C-alpha cells in the first residue's frame, strides 16, 4: 500500500479535498473490506 503513489493533478487534487464536471467515485469495497 505504501509503494503505489500519486503526483498527478486530476486524481491527487480531487483526493486532496477540479470542478469542471470530472469526479472520482469510491470503490464499493473499502481497502479494509479487501
Amino acid at each position: 500500500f505504501n509503494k503505489v503513489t500519486l503526483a498527478d493533478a486530476g486524481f491527487i487534487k480531487q483526493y486532496g479535498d477540479k470542478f469542471n464536471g470530472l469526479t472520482v467515485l469510491p470503490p464499493l469495497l473499502t481497502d479494509e473490506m479487501i
Binding site: 486524481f11 469542471n20 464536471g21 470530472l22 469526479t23 472520482v24 467515485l25 469510491p26 470503490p27
Partner: protein
Amino acid sequence: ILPVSMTKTSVDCTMYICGDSTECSNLLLQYGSFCTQLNRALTGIAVEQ
C-alpha cells in the same frame, strides 16, 4: 502483481462541455443523446471496476 481495477470516474458531460452556461446547455441539447451515452459508458466502466 496484477491490476484488478482502475479509479472509477464520472464526468458530468454538461458541466464539462458547458460550465453552467444555460446558453451552451441549450445548444448542447441539439447534439441529442451524445451526452447521455457518454455518462452511460463511464457508468458501465465504473460498475465494471
